[PDB]
Amino acid sequence: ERKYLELKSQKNLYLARLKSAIAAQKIEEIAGNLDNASASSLFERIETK
Amino acid sequence: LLERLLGEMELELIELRRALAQTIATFKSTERQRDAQQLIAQRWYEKAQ
Numbered sequence A: 001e002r003k004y005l006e007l008k009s010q011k012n013l014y015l016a017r018l019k020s021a022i023a024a025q026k027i028e029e030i031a032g033n034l035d036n037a038s039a040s041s042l043f044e045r046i047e048t049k
Numbered sequence B: 001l002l003e004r005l006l007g008e009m010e011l012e013l014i015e016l017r018r019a020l021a022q023t024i025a026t027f028k029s030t031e032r033q034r035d036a037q038q039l040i041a042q043r044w045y046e047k048a049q
């Protein structure tokens, strides 16, 4: 009983940490850096267009 | 076949125009990236100043 309670007391923290990292990664593919010029960042693709 | 060839060659000519447009676009992009790099170098020189 106590072991199960302990695991349930941490599942939420682990999920939050995973979601924050996913969103942080999803930032970069859009803008990244201003001098990125990779044609992968969505702003440079519009600029060349 | 004279008319067929003339229409096909019209298509080829507009295709060449589009290709040249893309080429000049990429040239402009490379020019901009060079300017950004020299700007960063100037910033570092000013920092050392």
Ligand SMILES: Nc1ncnc2c1ncn2[C@@H]1O[C@H](COP(=O)(O)OP(=O)(O)O)[C@@H](O)[C@H]1O
Pocket: A033, A035, A036, A037, A038, A039, A040
């Ligand atoms: N610190 C940095 N400063 C400037 N540009 C960077 C930096 N790090 C990465 N880049 C940019 O990343 C680009 C390479 O991305 P790209 O090769 O298109 O991605 P992929 O490897 O998926 O094809 C380069 O054009 C470079 O300008």
